[PDB]
Design a protein around this ligand. Structure first.
Ligand code: ANP
Ligand code: ANP
Ligand code: MG
Ligand code: MG
Lengths: 358, 353
């Protein structure tokens, strides 16, 4: 283990709120000062943790690759430790380095998932029931969600060439039109559903602005994250509805209700897709668990939709739960904090405690 | 900590299935041998657990009362270990003793509740202890639900003049009409709601038998337990609906859907009572959490969840703050899988504390 990894793994990650992230777009040297220290801390924490996985898994070429990438990115960032935040050239080179790191990590999720599979056929193992593997993957993916979020925020606000969405500050939409994201995600799921079944359920949507009656619903949020969650939940609800009702003349719609309360934004997605036994609910949330075979774009198969969507919801202190009525249908519920100041990063830390779980 | 208490606490409770409890009426001497042993075991296990509580809680007059009652009952029951299961007189007296024990324990819930309230009101409590009390109360009340169940099953089936409804086997209905219980529980709540609010929401009920299409929904269950869960959840939904819609002419109905699947019987109760912030959701199940001034001390949710969990079911709540709440009950659809979930005072429990 490189001394840099050992050293920086000693610190605990420092979570930011969405408000703080927005404010970076309200100087560059402040974001530079924070990130050149924080990214190595987050990378070092997860690198130490990778060094605990089963010999058989850590040795998969896929995991070894991811490990090599994170180490290099860590080194690239630490090289900025000497520079002054007032050094304009250093700031520019830092943006270039974040772009390089972002590009290097672009295929991390797919490589790690492939490692899980290079693990299954190269060893005897059930990833679904492997509790340590599940614990690790949640932490590994949350760590990635957080580093990607932080680097993209800096790149999209301060770079010259990458501006992202004009209406966003970084990747954050201060006035996220939730219902619009819902409608977009639904249509994306629908197009996919049609290719697999030549039919798809329609959307029945209701919205209630409890905080401001009859007003459009907006909150500060990361639309790409919201879109991901909804897309995955819609794909699930559509697949279940169509298959459960394939022997019937028509399809019941998917009912969605969007509610804005004083401190929470809640989205409920209900289907009449037959549901699942309460006994199986937790399994649904395990990485790789799927009733479809492991896989242009697959409607189902990866076994990632639920756990990853839940990570996005919990990343800023929200949550995602499934409550099913076996024999009838399922209600999927997303909770998001309605205040940017309470939307604080939920980050895994490598410490005595975490180690105890392993 | 009398000898019998330490002795019987050394055995671990033996959980029975709904399927086994049905056979109580198919003999009396076997049920007698089982209970004269099992009841003392369950009482002793919880009695030892009580001695682990904070000294100021244990010394409340309420906890001391509960402890003295459980000890007397344990002794009354242990006395029967010297009698023969073939002693016809011993069998009759055993039933009389079960009735005596049931009477003695009648006030257990409120009494334990009072002790907790006094302890929390007068003493500073750290997060660890607070968590331990919730854990204790869940175990203490589940323990009482289990002993009450076993004793009633024996009395109702083998008593000379306290046998109860002939259509049930003890307190169990082999063909429980779930929808009927739902409707009755709704009405009991509505009657109370009207009395206090002068108005009450209506019921909109839907039913789906996925296990046997178009057919009525029945499962083997203890109707009084099911009624308790529904009644409490209905009172909560009605109070929330009425108070949230006070500035409204009418009241939205309470929507209920009953579903029978292969492994589960599921009941979802939906209201438009404004819901609760995500931050408070977990807190709702704490015994000391209540927004009541139709409502009370905060027992509805946690006790209802215990009844659901007692035979391996569950009770969950999800809310849409600013709109309403969905309360859902899950019960096993197979009697063979409906097995008592019992707390045991072993080293594993001791450490949890
Ligand atoms: N609304 C639903 N109704 C019934 N079953 C569901 C529902 N949602 C999820 N499931 C079950 O949970 C399993 C895993 O869901 P998920 O985690 O999203 O991965 P997947 O949909 O199977 N593969 P993918 O989404 O491509 O990563 C599904 O394959 C279903 O068996
Ligand atoms: N459907 C609901 N809608 C809104 N709030 C609810 C709902 N159900 C429960 N609550 C809240 O949770 C608290 C506790 O509920 P509960 O555990 O049933 O005890 P209680 O109703 O307060 N007293 P009790 O008479 O013992 O049931 C309530 O006082 C409410 O603040
Ligand atoms: Mg999916
Ligand atoms: Mg109540």
């Amino acid at each position: 283990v490189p001394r840099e990894v050992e050293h920086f793994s000693r610190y605990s990650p420092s979570p930011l709120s969405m408000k703080q992230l927005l404010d970076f777009g309200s100087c560059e040297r402040t974001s530079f000062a924070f990130l050149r220290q924080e990214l190595p801390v987050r990378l070092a924490n997860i690198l130490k943790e990778i060094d605990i996985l089963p010999t058989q898994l850590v040795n998969t070429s896929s995991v070894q690759l991811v490990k090599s990438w994170y180490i290099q990115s860590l080194m690239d960032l630490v090289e900025f430790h000497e520079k002054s935040p007032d050094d304009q050239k250093a700031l520019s080179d830092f943006v270039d380095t974040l772009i390089k790191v972002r590009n290097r990590h672009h295929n991390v999720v797919p490589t790690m998932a492939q490692g899980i599979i290079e693990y299954k056929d190269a060893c005897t193992v059930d990833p679904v029931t492997n509790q340590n593997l599940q614990y690790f993957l949640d932490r590994f993916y949350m760590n990635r969600i957080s580093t990607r979020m932080l680097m993209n925020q800096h790149i999209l606000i301060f770079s010259d060439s990458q501006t992202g969405n004009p209406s966003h500050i970084g990747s954050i939409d201060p006035n996220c039109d939730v219902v619009a994201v819902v409608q977009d995600a639904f249509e994306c799921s629908r197009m996919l559903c049609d290719q697999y079944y030549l039919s798809s359920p329609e959307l029945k949507l209701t919205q209630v602005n409890g905080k401001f009656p009859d007003q459009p619903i907006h909150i500060v949020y990361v639309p790409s994250h919201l879109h991901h969650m909804l897309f995955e939940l819609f794909k699930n609800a559509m697949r279940a509805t169509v298959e459960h009702q394939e022997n019937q003349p028509s399809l019941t719609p998917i009912e969605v209700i969007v509610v804005l309360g004083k401190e929470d934004l809640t989205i409920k997605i209900s289907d009449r897709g037959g549901g699942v036994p309460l006994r199986i609910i937790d399994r649904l949330f395990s990485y790789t668990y799927s009733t479809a075979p492991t896989p242009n774009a697959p409607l189902a198969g990866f076994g990632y939709g639920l756990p990853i969507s839940r990570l996005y919801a919990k990343y800023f202190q929200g949550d995602l739960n499934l409550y099913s009525l076996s024999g009838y249908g399922t209600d999927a519920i997303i909770y998001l904090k309605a205040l940017s100041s309470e939307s604080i990063e939920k980050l895994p830390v490598f410490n005595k405690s975490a180690f105890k779980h392993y």
